[PDB]
Amino acid sequence: MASNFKKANMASSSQRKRMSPKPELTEEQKQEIREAFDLFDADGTGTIDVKELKVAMRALGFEPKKEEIKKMISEIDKEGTGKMNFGDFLTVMTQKMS
């Protein structure tokens, strides 16, 4: 089916307790990059766009340093405009803060 015919998930079993961190990103970082990218990519697709990713940067930034939220949105909007997958969002947002 191409169009949205409704009734995907009615009973919302929202399991925020799955991977406990080993030598990796911790509770604060795990929650903010998973829960923002999964809020825009809900059913399991791949890429989030600059409209959705700018709303993701407003919720994730809060209070930041200087060239962080404007630098991510203007640097991936370049060759075929702005599209981001989860490997880009995880590596660029964790290495710029941690």
Q: Any known ligand binding at 77? A: no
Nearest Cα to Cα of residue 59 among 36, 30, 85 = 36
The length of the chain, given as a count of residues: 98
Q: How far apart are CA 39 and CA 14, in angstroms?
A: 12
24/67 Cα distance (integer angstroms): 25
User: Cα–Cα distances in Å, from 89 out to 5, 23, 32?
Assistant: 30, 19, 11
> Which residue is listed with tokens 């981001």?
84
Q: In order of start, what are the domains of the chain with their CATH numbers?
A: 26-98 (1.10.238.10)
Is 52 labeled as ligand-binding?
Answer: yes
CA–CA separation, 48 and 25 (whole Å): 21
Please give the method by which this entry was determined: NMR
β-pairing verdict for 47-49 and 83-85 = antiparallel
45 is in an annotated binding site: yes
The residue behind tokens 């600059």 is: 50
